[PDB]
From Swiss-Prot, chains A, B:
Protein name: Green fluorescent protein
UniProt keyword list: Chromophore, Luminescence, Photoprotein
Effect of residue 78 to H/W/F: Results in significantly red-shifted excitation and emission maxima
Protein's job: Energy-transfer acceptor. Its role is to transduce the blue chemiluminescence of the protein aequorin into green fluorescent light by energy transfer. Fluoresces in vivo upon receiving energy from the Ca(2+)-activated photoprotein aequorin.
Effect recorded for residue 232 to V: In EBFP2.0; shifts the excitation and emission spectra to shorter wavelengths and increases quantum yields compared to BFP
InterPro entries per the UniProt record, alphabetical: GFP, GFP-related, Green_fluorescent_prot
Annotated phenotype, changing residue 42 to V: In P9; increases fluorescence at 475 nm excitation. In R10-3; matures to the red-emitting state with excitation and emission maxima at 555 and 585 nm, respectively
Outcome (variant: residue 207 to E): In mut1.27; shifts fluorescence lifetime from 3.03 to 2.85 ns
Result, substituting residue 203 to S: In alphaGFP/cycle 3 GFP; improves folding at 37 degrees Celsius, reduces aggregation at high concentrations, and increases the diffusibility of the protein inside cells
Distribution of this protein across tissues and organs: Photocytes.
Amino acid sequence: SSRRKWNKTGHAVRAIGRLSSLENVYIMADKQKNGIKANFKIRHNIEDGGVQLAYHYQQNTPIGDGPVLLPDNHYLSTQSKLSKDPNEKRDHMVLLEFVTAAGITLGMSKGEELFTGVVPILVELDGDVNGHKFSVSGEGEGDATYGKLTLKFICTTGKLPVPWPTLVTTLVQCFSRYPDHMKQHDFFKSAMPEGYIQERTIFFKDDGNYKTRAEVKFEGDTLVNRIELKGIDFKEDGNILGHKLEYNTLTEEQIAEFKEAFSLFDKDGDGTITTKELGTVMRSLGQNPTEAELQDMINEVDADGNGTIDFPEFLTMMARKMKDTDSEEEIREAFRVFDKDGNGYISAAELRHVMTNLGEKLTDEEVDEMIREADIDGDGQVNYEEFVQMMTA
Amino acid sequence: SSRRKWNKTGHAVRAIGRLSSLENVYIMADKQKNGIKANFKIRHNIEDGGVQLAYHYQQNTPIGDGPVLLPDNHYLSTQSKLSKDPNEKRDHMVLLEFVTAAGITLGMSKGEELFTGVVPILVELDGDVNGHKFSVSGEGEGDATYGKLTLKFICTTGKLPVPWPTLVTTLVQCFSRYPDHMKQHDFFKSAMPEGYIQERTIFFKDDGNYKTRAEVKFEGDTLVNRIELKGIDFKEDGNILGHKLEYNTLTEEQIAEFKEAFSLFDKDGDGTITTKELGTVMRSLGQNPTEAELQDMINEVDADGNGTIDFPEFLTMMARKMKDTDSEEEIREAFRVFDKDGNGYISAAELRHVMTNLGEKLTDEEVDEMIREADIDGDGQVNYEEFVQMMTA
Ligand SMILES: [Ca+2]
Ligand SMILES: [Ca+2]
Ligand SMILES: [Ca+2]
Ligand SMILES: [Ca+2]
Ligand SMILES: [Ca+2]
Ligand SMILES: [Ca+2]
Ligand SMILES: [Ca+2]
Ligand SMILES: [Ca+2]
């Protein structure tokens, strides 16, 4: 029973750790400066084990003179993916991010209209850390409907004197997705096109700090983020100047596939799936759930409780990994949806029917090429074994 | 791009399947009968692949004449674990379940008082399926504070003529946990001690049906469920009479360890952790978060949005499996909490301090035995490597 004592005590201590390790961006109004303030912590993994904490303090204020939206307390949730470009010989970072706003319970600007489509982005940074001067240039696109950013950054001075992950937060929160009931709390878009000034201090525990000032604004059709950074008090042999942090190089391909699938449900392209939209899709495939049943389905996956499914919630649902036998049954059920006449073979006619009903457009010849790619035995249709290979390999 | 077409289309079809496979018990009032009705579906795994659906329809009405609570629409969420007793030679089933009520947004009987502690349970069933007569007897305990049931059932007529999993739903929803804001919607406890009648029809797709009637009531200190079951139209070679269903024999031990840990937080024993309680625990270990920070922590794991953490939410948080490197860092952080003076060794004095502050009672000699079990090199303290072995092996 000594072991029972160790276990029970260890569980309680670990519970406290799981509860307190949140990396969300917590935002409040700053009415005195006609803007907002924020605070949060980032946990950077150290190579070969450990974490380097980075404590962030933030303030934003408008550049122009027009009225802006000042929010109730809330937070932003972010997922980032870092990678490398096989063809690029300069020191660089490729970045993909999804961000959503939450923390205000369902009971509920001109700049918002500037973000309804895909917007080009330019980022320019001049830095000086412990006297080491450097510059960074980036370009890409933002798609606020999905809370999505995609950019590539290059060090334009040679070798970057600090780790790329430490610069991610410095290198456009106007691209966050604010849900319908939170539109009156989106300070960032409300300040456009004239823009805002964003300032931070970032404290690296047991090491130095960065101080940053940036201007974020439209220049023509392009959203531009221009930044100055100064770092002081860094240790030559610490995790930053010593380059001891992990560069975390699920896949981009898969996420893009899931985005395309999401769009088949999201008929009006506003970035969320309503009961009306889900029902339209289900009826097109021959299932006719009631309004209450549709709402029961949505409720299960509705993380922020606003009653509709956004892309990150859809992504979470589809990313959940299954027991190999549960995944097997899921594929059998999918096969039955395609095989409309139940004869054990999916015909070209059946495949076209399912695709066009979902809302996809393609020619008969394109449908035939799909059957060809899957049709191992050459009989002109797709049997169950062929379907499994197509879906899982 | 044929493969891209297959993938995107398959994702949409699988999404529809994940959304529509809910097994929750959906409850509504039945005002005409002074009771409730419910409907739900159960998915039974078939050996070697597939699922056997069982469509459930349910009605409950009070036995006695006193006033009862008639609920707004809501649902019950259930997790079940089935197992065998190595010592038992009779045909049998061991069962562990946790059930909670939800589906009513935070904006908000005498029988309730009968369930504040641990209550003994007796279950008796007489059945007849396609003319095959059988009986079942079970005994165990219910602990509604945690929504917990534990029982063992025996077939008292010999070999059971149907699979054990098909009888689980028939074989005491008064043991469900209703959260504070939902107490006025708990019909089941409000009907006690006189009790209620529970009737169901259960339709097994492509096969026969069960019809059941049960009386659920107190006899002395014991909650008793006495049932008659009649099954008709079953196929001799189907999944039921053919015994082709899986018996799903995470661990009971681990769950009990986690329950003990939960109790260290839940100071007043009401089955939920408030910000006051979490703060009390954190302060006892030397951390002093503000009220707003405590609420931010709770919000992340607060599935039903009522603002506090119940045992199944705590269990979900602690069951989430980590990347091996993330789990490694979690254990390093736990070690630092124990090692108060930071010298790299946990002393008996330090271990006692952490345990007694959490609220555990034990003697100095019992603390020494814990150190002994972990102290591989015999120096009287626990170093990091010894701690890792104790926590992970
Ligand atoms: Ca939509
Ligand atoms: Ca939502
Ligand atoms: Ca067919
Ligand atoms: Ca074929
Ligand atoms: Ca409590
Ligand atoms: Ca809760
Ligand atoms: Ca020590
Ligand atoms: Ca030792």
